[PDB]
Write a protein that holds these residues in place. Structure first.
Motif, PDB file in Angstrom:
ATOM      1  N   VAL A  64       7.441  25.076  -9.686  1.00 21.41           N
ATOM      2  CA  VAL A  64       8.026  23.785 -10.057  1.00 21.41           C
ATOM      3  C   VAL A  64       6.947  22.754 -10.417  1.00 21.41           C
ATOM      4  N   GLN A  65       5.928  22.602  -9.572  1.00 24.91           N
ATOM      5  CA  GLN A  65       4.887  21.617  -9.855  1.00 24.91           C
ATOM      6  C   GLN A  65       4.034  21.944 -11.086  1.00 24.91           C
ATOM      7  N   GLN A  66       3.798  23.229 -11.354  1.00 26.91           N
ATOM      8  CA  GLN A  66       3.102  23.577 -12.582  1.00 26.91           C
ATOM      9  C   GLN A  66       3.962  23.167 -13.769  1.00 26.91           C
ATOM     10  N   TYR A  67       5.262  23.423 -13.646  1.00 28.30           N
ATOM     11  CA  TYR A  67       6.223  23.095 -14.685  1.00 28.30           C
ATOM     12  C   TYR A  67       6.211  21.590 -14.931  1.00 28.30           C
ATOM     13  N   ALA A  68       6.306  20.834 -13.841  1.00 27.10           N
ATOM     14  CA  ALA A  68       6.341  19.374 -13.898  1.00 27.10           C
ATOM     15  C   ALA A  68       5.042  18.798 -14.458  1.00 27.10           C
ATOM     16  N   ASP A  69       3.915  19.227 -13.894  1.00 24.96           N
ATOM     17  CA  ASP A  69       2.600  18.834 -14.402  1.00 24.96           C
ATOM     18  C   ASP A  69       2.431  19.175 -15.873  1.00 24.96           C
ATOM     19  N   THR A  70       2.971  20.314 -16.322  1.00 21.96           N
ATOM     20  CA  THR A  70       2.869  20.666 -17.745  1.00 21.96           C
ATOM     21  C   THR A  70       3.633  19.681 -18.629  1.00 21.96           C
ATOM     22  N   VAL A  71       4.846  19.322 -18.215  1.00 17.57           N
ATOM     23  CA  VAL A  71       5.624  18.339 -18.962  1.00 17.57           C
ATOM     24  C   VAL A  71       4.862  17.016 -19.024  1.00 17.57           C
ATOM     25  N   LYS A  72       4.223  16.658 -17.911  1.00 16.05           N
ATOM     26  CA  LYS A  72       3.449  15.420 -17.842  1.00 16.05           C
ATOM     27  C   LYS A  72       2.287  15.497 -18.825  1.00 16.05           C
ATOM     28  N   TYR A  73       1.578  16.624 -18.825  1.00 18.00           N
ATOM     29  CA  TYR A  73       0.522  16.856 -19.807  1.00 18.00           C
ATOM     30  C   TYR A  73       1.047  16.739 -21.227  1.00 18.00           C
ATOM     31  N   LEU A  74       2.189  17.368 -21.503  1.00 17.46           N
ATOM     32  CA  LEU A  74       2.697  17.367 -22.874  1.00 17.46           C
ATOM     33  C   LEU A  74       3.149  15.978 -23.299  1.00 17.46           C
ATOM     34  N   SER A  75       3.606  15.200 -22.330  1.00 13.86           N
ATOM     35  CA  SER A  75       4.077  13.844 -22.559  1.00 13.86           C
ATOM     36  C   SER A  75       2.928  12.912 -22.967  1.00 13.86           C
ATOM     37  N   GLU A  76       1.743  13.170 -22.418  1.00 12.76           N
ATOM     38  CA  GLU A  76       0.553  12.374 -22.703  1.00 12.76           C
ATOM     39  C   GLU A  76      -0.238  12.839 -23.926  1.00 12.76           C
ATOM     40  N   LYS A  77       0.338  13.744 -24.709  1.00 14.58           N
ATOM     41  CA  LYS A  77      -0.379  14.362 -25.817  1.00 14.58           C
ATOM     42  C   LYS A  77      -0.299  13.501 -27.070  1.00 14.58           C
TER      43      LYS A  77
END
Length: 188
Positions: free
Chosen positions: A175-188
């Motif tokens: 879940v946290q990898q998933y969440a952190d990935t969305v956060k990364y993609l959001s800041e792209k």
């Protein structure tokens, strides 16, 4: 790099202008969707880690469950218009997949009634043109990304999460990898 295109996410060859910032698709018929929402709580852990000012959108899809599947897309439109998503998501998932007590539109209606939405209010919304256009939005968004499977998540109509490239050994860590990935993609 640590987040590679084609590994934790894929890039749409054909970007979707004007798409919601974070967009999740599901079906109440979808077994992995039941996990995502009821066991993993993905939607929620993503929200908790999104930067300020990024809003989250969730849409139901038609391509599972035939006629009842469409009824559920319209019911989810009602859920969004009345703002009762957090009161009906659990009993719709369980009514469909757990108890299998949801077999008709009227059974869907029973869930909202039980959740405390008045009959008159549900029926009015169900039959409303605001709900018809909310149904339209759900269908368009899925059309814009040529969606054939759920659960699915898209960020800024340019990136699509790829959870298949992630260790599911520990649910929490996934879940946290998933969440952190969305956060990364959001800041792209």
């Amino acid at each position: 790099a640590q987040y590679e295109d084609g590994k934790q996410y894929t890039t749409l060859e054909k970007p979707v202008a004007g798409a919601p910032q974070v967009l999740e698709f599901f079906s109440f018929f979808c077994p992995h969707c039941y996990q995502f929402e009821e066991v993993l709580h993905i939607s929620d852990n993503v929200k908790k880690k999104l930067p300020e000012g990024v809003k989250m959108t969730k849409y139901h899809v038609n391509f599972m469950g035939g006629d009842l599947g469409k009824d559920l897309t319209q019911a989810w439109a009602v859920a969004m218009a009345l703002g009762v998503e957090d009161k009906v998501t659990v009993p719709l998932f369980e009514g469909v997949q757990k108890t299998q007590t949801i077999r008709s539109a009227s059974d869907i209606r029973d869930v909202f009634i039980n959740a405390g939405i008045k009959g008159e209010e549900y029926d009015a919304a169900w039959n409303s043109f605001v709900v018809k256009s909310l149904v339209a939005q759900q269908e368009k968004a899925a059309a814009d990304v040529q969606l054939r499977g759920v659960p699915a998540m898209f960020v800024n109509g340019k990136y699509q999460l790829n959870p298949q490239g992630m260790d599911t050994s520990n649910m929490d860590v996934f879940v946290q990898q998933y969440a952190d990935t969305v956060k990364y993609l959001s800041e792209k």
